[PDB]
Amino acid sequence: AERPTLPIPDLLTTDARNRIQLTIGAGQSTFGGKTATTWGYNGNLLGPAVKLQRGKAVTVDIYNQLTEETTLHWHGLEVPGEVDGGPQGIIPPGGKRSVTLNVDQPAATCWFHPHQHGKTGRQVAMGLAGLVVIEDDEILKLMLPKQWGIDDVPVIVQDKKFSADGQIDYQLDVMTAAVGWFGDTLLTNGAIYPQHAAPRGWLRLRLLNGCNARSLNFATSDNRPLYVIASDGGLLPEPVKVSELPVLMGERFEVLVEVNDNKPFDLVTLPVSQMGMAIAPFDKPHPVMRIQPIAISASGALPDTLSSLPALPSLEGLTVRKLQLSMDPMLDMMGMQMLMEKYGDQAMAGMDHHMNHGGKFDFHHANKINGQAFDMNKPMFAAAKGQYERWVISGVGDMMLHPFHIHGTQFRILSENGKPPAAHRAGWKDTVKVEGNVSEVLVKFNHDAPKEHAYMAHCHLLEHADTGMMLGFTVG
Ligand SMILES: [Cu+2]
Ligand SMILES: [Cu+2]
Ligand SMILES: [Cu+2]
Ligand SMILES: [Cu+2]
Ligand SMILES: [O-]
User: Fold this and answer.
1) Distance 250 CA to ligand 1 centre (A)
2) Who contacts 111 (Cβ-Cβ below 8 Å, separation ≥6)?
3) What DSSP letter does each residue of 45-92 carry, written as one string?
4) Closest Cα to atom 1, ligand 5: which residue?
5) Within this chain, do residues 133 and 273 fall inside the same structural domain, yes or no?
6) Are residues 362 and 290 in the same domain?
7) Among all ligands shown, which has an atom nearest to the Cα of 87?
8) Domain assignment of residue 419, given as a range
9) Distance 431 CA to ligand 2 centre (A)
10) In 3-state terms, what secondary structure has residue 337?
11) Where is this region: Methionine-rich region?
């Protein structure tokens, strides 16, 4: 059998009333010939790409046709807390919520997904994620590849595992609370190892790591380079040529790759040094999708310059906030034990050389920031509006991977886990690596968030956030 074609999310724009309609619902999908109940936006699985324009307002009508509560968060969008869709943004089952997004940030690929309190991992694992394509005047002048689904394609990469009956096998338990939910099956826009037919010249890939817990590292099967043009929050100042591209959970990068006649190649993910993530088939390079060259010329350019990246300011005088991430030692030890018992030494490949005691020892609140498991009723602090702050985020005390994400902003990384950031990570980011060390970011919030609709800051290893590694904060 031939490989399925890469599914392409519909690129959705507003109607005459200026509205975009999103319906959240359950249906069936097929994986390896076996049906599974899945959830999607405007469909059975995953979701559309919502197209937004800087300086224009759109209204999104969100219909929850699930039988449980959910929320819809716009990861990477700089919007007020009231429309941010964090855990306080509840949409009742069978209900509708509408939000107006006043887009005011540069062109970027953002995304959206649920933020249901303590259930975000499950709801994403079930299928809910969509994309946001923000454009502005600046990006269109660059004449990058721009034909959606032809030479400009989104690539949402996710793992799942399935039970013998074919259903998605999700659990939030002591093991996954420590190391995350991960699986053995890799999906690319929902499909297993699809092919994408691309014209000769430049191919633009908008890469999203949509895994709950698995970090990825993209490369090509024949070692042709990737030219990074954009990060979470938009364009880099100029392209950055890489041979491999690590992507943390929830991160986006846009890359250009050359397509030449008669030479198909795969986009692959390389084994990572993260606990549990190098179990077969992920102990070796793993194909993500096959690029099939078409002998028709592609019109897109890779310009020498993309955008202007403003200078980092002086750091003296700016508020410094400490965010200490932590995991309960016993539940970290127990989750790791369970992982080692199940998979053996392979669960640490590539790394460096039973009774009820009550609610105090519950793994559901074992993960914390500044000694507190997330309390939705108590924002931990009030950040300044329109002022640069230096946020210092520490994972000293455990060796788990914490891609730390801050709502309401695109920031600049000053130190990523104890080193200056790589060039392609030095632009606009909404995620920073924290793993047994300390990161520092320079952040500014341009919009208000009240106690009732607070911004979140949390680990994007979703099972950590669901078991307490999140805080709320207000702005204004
Ligand atoms: Cu997110
Ligand atoms: Cu977010
Ligand atoms: Cu974490
Ligand atoms: Cu979030
Ligand atoms: O998030």
Assistant:
1) 5
2) 74, 75, 76, 129, 130, 131, 132, 156, 208, 210, 250, 252
3) SB--EEEEETT-EEEEEEEE-SSS-B--EEET----GGGS--TT--B-
4) 75
5) no
6) no
7) 4
8) 317-476
9) 9
10) helix
11) 327-359
